[PDB]
Amino acid sequence: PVNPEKLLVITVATAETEGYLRFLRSAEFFNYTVRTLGLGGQKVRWLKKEMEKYADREDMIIMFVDSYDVILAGSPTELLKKFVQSGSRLLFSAESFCWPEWGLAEQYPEVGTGKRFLNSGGFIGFATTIHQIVRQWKYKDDDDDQLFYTRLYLDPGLREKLSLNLDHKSRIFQNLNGALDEVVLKFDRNRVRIRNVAYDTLPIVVHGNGPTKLQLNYLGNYVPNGWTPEGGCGFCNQDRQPPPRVFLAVFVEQPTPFLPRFLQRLLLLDYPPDRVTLFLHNNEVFHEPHIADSWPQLQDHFSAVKLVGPEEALSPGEARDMAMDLCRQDPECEFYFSLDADAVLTNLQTLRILIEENRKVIAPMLSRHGKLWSNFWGALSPDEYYARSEDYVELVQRKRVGVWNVPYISQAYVIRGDTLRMELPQRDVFSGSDTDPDMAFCKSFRDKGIFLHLSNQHEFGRLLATSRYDTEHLHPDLWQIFDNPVDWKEQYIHENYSRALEGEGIVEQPCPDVYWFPLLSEQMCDELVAEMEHYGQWSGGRHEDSRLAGGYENVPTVDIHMKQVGYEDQWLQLLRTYVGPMTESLFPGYHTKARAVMNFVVRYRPDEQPSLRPHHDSSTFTLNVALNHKGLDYEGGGCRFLRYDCVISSPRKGWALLHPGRLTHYHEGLPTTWGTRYIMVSFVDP
Amino acid sequence: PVNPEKLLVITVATAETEGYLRFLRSAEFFNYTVRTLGLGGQKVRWLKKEMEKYADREDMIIMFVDSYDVILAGSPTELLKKFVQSGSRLLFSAESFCWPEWGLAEQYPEVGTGKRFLNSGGFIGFATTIHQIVRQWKYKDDDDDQLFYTRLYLDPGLREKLSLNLDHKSRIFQNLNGALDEVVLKFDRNRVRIRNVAYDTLPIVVHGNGPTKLQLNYLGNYVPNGWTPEGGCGFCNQDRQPPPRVFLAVFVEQPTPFLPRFLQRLLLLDYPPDRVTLFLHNNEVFHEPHIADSWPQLQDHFSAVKLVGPEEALSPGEARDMAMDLCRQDPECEFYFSLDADAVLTNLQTLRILIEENRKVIAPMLSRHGKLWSNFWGALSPDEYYARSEDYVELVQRKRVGVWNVPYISQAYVIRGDTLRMELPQRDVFSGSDTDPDMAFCKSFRDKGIFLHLSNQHEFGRLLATSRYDTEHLHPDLWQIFDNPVDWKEQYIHENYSRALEGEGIVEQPCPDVYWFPLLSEQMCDELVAEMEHYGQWSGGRHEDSRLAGGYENVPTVDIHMKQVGYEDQWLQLLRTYVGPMTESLFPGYHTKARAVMNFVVRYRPDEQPSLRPHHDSSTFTLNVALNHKGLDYEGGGCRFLRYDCVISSPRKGWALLHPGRLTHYHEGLPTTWGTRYIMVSFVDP
């Protein structure tokens, strides 16, 4: 049994990058002893000088491995046991490819189903045997170390004398390149390993050599104590006097729904505004009225503000370069926060949480509501298109939560200002090529060995759909009930609707079988009324309605139907989602799909039609929503139910009436004496 | 100016018949002096002997006229003025036909547009001139008086010497035969005359000679004081201790609706039953159960009773002969009352009123409800078929009321027993020929000069329709809603329905929008239930209904639809007539034609289906009629309206519930624990 205190791990690194520190944490997890060369071709020269101290130490086992692209998955005890089991005095890692000299592939011994060729990224042997190898180095730093070990190994006499071997079946070393299909994660309670399903082994050293850095990043999120079924993630903050100064950059590169809401939300972020500088690039002339309306509040709120409008003809890549460089060139910019207009931050502590994670680059996970689409990618295709990773759905669904090393992030991220100055000083981060600005940004950080972190440890927010947003309306957000229903409800559905639907005594019954509940917010009423007048073609003479009064005759109103303004599909959707469930609640036993042929807005004026004579409705039940204020906008009565001698004297603006349309509720519209009275009517289930 | 006290009217009559007395009343109306010969050919012999007393009375004007077929229409003053105007000493009446000797027509003077030939039924002249004519009679009673006067008149020398003339243009005498189209009634305030529109004259003497007795009967109902626009009829009773003994004869010669009702009505006639003998001839085996059920009550009610059933194979003519002869052969039968089963006597004083009119034969006017058809004819065709008289519609509509001399009566009449014994002693009154028994009866009385009187002075009753009465039912009267709606309502519609419909606080509201009103009588419920069980094919497994419960699913019942028993058309009629107007009253503003696809009788039993789970109705409103008694026939609850926490604990048998079918009135049928519970359901306006 070889003594673990006699095992020494040697690696080389010239800077404490995130990869090197990831390697050290995995080594410290298993209580390895690590000697790092070169911090304070050239690899062998450093190792050879290092080995002269251990030239006679037959009692020492030394494992040399890379650090930037290596994680440890097993204990020194298991490692020394497998080394003794190999019966070798210097065991090299094996791999699928023979390089740099492909011609030397013939000199290699036949291996069978295992890997045949040497890889100098990881080997383990006795100090004495290794010293006899590395002392034979008398070349220069530019020269190839892989060729040095390969030629020495291919020496048949030197191979048998020193007992050199290759770990053919990946018992100890696992090189990822050429063997991605062989490696799977093997989970335990508080530790994760890899398994080679080709040779049924549990390698100790995971080496992401060649073009497999992204696959190592993925494995490194678990191995050895990245994320565990019982302990969760092991490097995140988990459970959570001046805060750092932050440059907040907002980007509007396309017409975006609910932008006035996004701008107003900027005033609610729980981070001191005197410590935040706002940069806002708006590329859309359609959003110029929006930016202008809320700019006075933003200017008073934040420390400093700056707007770059559509007039400067800035492409998204140029605007993102400019905003990022403004932070880079300011020694007082400690953190850079890039937030796109289609990102809805439901968690107002997002900027704090991400800063406290203390990463170079970190994004809050944001997903399109009810779908898998989100602001990060788990994997890439060879030509850098989206590909779904093995754990992508688990992360989006938050089955596994933590801080994850991912190939792609977007729409919201926080970048350490020191990183922009020291490690990424160039201006062309998003620009400089024909590739997409968002992908050029991720590649720029990947090319410098900078991890892109993603946190789903909390609920941060969601992503608006902007794909096909019809801007040809007076209020386009009114037509967003399908694409962004969650945000459409927060803007247009009355705030106390859900409380009323859940009971809580909000629903009223002003007349016997007539119910009264809050439905539309004051903004929906104002925009719907405005949209009606913008059309302007109200009905008049020869207008016919589905009303029954004193026999087979019809009662008309000055009105506009939803079909005319192209809003029936949208209003029908509201009827299904909100009116329907309310009607089944208030009328136990009744079921409805909220069918409605007659949906229309009535206008009452003393100038034209001020009243509506007694009549019945061609409907099972009728929805009657007030659209403006009694007293402020109009005077005069509302609704009278003659058989019950009951009158809705004061209609509440956002609220709606629900009454039977036939037989029992002969109803009348009282004359409107001053101003203009607007209501929204639906004859449901005809 | 000739003195009216010098004018004497002479007529001949051997009995004081109704025609003779009619003539006398018209004569007494104008204060004529009438000498009747022959009371205590042969006509001339009596007149000739009479005239010998006045052979030298040049101061006397004598008018000889018939009496049985003559009515006077003018005053002696006007008569003497027109006689003086004629410039004649013996003026005969003129007519269109030359008889008995047609060959003598050539000897007559040419007359132009007037009548050319003599009629010996009426002449006026000086007593002296008449004596010189009548004294020339030396023949026998069998010989012809018309030929006697005609040959004397055609003597050219005697015609000029005595100044004989004919009333060519009907200035004084109007013979009806051959001039019916020339005669119209001329009305005044309190007197009616005739006018000859051919010659524009107002004749004094109306003579219904030849085959014109019926037309004289018609004229005689007005002239001179028969019926007047301001005085009304002048020989009727107008404004109304043992009563005379009466033989009441009832005839059932065809299947007749509501016969149990007719039989029970016999017990309510306001005439002492100890003075009435009942004869009942029933020809229908279908009515044998009816006669038997009510015979014990009839036997106890009347003085004596006698039934002649279908087993004696008696034709209607034979039965009517037998019943009439039973009265004729009994000196104690003072009046004979013949009442057919299709005659509904709404006036229980009918027998009194007709007896107090003091006529030989008199009928109460009875008409089919809402139609002109009635129990008398105003006119006849030459072959004795129905013809409409000039005043028929006025009499049926009771625009003119009185007691009218008519050619035909039926279905109800009162005959003086003395008339049957003295004036109509034969047995074959209705029988003895191939003519109809009802027409043979009228002809028999007409042939004896007996008037057939008809009284519309009061509202007496109506005539049931028996034309197509489908006897192939357990209760055929249930299907009489179309043919006899008035009588169908009295039997099957609840007695307090009309009072409830007119207000009076009978209608109740046991639950919020659920109304409760009396609809069906206890007899309708018992017969409808009995008719359902007689069919017996109640529904069971796979039975589907138009009920909505907890989604798109259907709730079944053990029931039978009206369509199955062939009663939908009849029940739909009841819905229109009675349910409809009630629904529009209780739901002001709602209009309905009472459409209903689902009409059915539900049966509840603990053995089978005792309850009905909560559900809605496929209807605007639902009619729910109880059909039996809670407690007596069944135990267990009725109807529960869940949204209102209201229960119809005790359903009233005849009553019905009216509630909305959709949205608001989720209702449930409580389990029936004992017995059998029947209800009638209609889903109106689906």
Ligand SMILES: *[C@@H]1O[C@H](CO)[C@@H](O[C@@H]2O[C@H](CO)[C@@H](O)[C@H](O)[C@H]2NC(C)=O)[C@H](O)[C@H]1NC(C)=O
């Ligand atoms: C939703 O309900 C809340 C509470 O029931 C409403 O809040 C109140 O607003 C009125 C003024 O309109 C104040 O006088 C009360 O003091 C408030 N109550 C509370 C508890 O804050 C709120 O107005 C309702 N929403 C809308 C749109 O009216």
Ligand SMILES: *[C@@H]1O[C@H](CO)[C@@H](O[C@@H]2O[C@H](CO)[C@@H](O)[C@H](O)[C@H]2NC(C)=O)[C@H](O)[C@H]1NC(C)=O
């Ligand atoms: C129709 O209404 C009358 C009066 O409202 C009902 O008559 C009463 O009958 C009950 C017995 O059922 C008696 O106790 C009362 O004294 C009666 N009142 C009068 C004023 O006579 C009659 O019952 C109703 N019709 C039906 C079929 O029930």
Ligand SMILES: *[C@@H]1O[C@H](CO)[C@@H](O)[C@H](O)[C@H]1NC(C)=O
């Ligand atoms: C590593 O060593 C420390 C003491 O130096 C010990 O507490 C810990 O349990 C060790 N961990 C492992 C995995 O052996």
Ligand SMILES: *[C@@H]1O[C@H](CO)[C@@H](O)[C@H](O)[C@H]1NC(C)=O
């Ligand atoms: C008939 O005579 C009586 C008196 O005898 C007289 O009262 C009556 O008015 C007369 N009627 C007519 C119509 O002359």
Ligand SMILES: O=C(O)CCC(=O)C(=O)O
């Ligand atoms: O003005 C009202 O409140 C009555 C509305 C109504 O019944 C209708 O819109 O047809």
Ligand SMILES: O=C(O)CCC(=O)C(=O)O
């Ligand atoms: O039994 C009752 O009264 C409920 C009747 C009902 O709702 C039905 O007949 O469908």
Ligand SMILES: [Fe+2]
């Ligand atoms: Fe309309």
Ligand SMILES: [Fe+2]
């Ligand atoms: Fe309406």
Ligand SMILES: [Fe+2]
């Ligand atoms: Fe049924």
Ligand SMILES: [Fe+2]
């Ligand atoms: Fe029902």
Ligand SMILES: [Mn+2]
């Ligand atoms: Mn490497």
Ligand SMILES: [Mn+2]
């Ligand atoms: Mn005569």
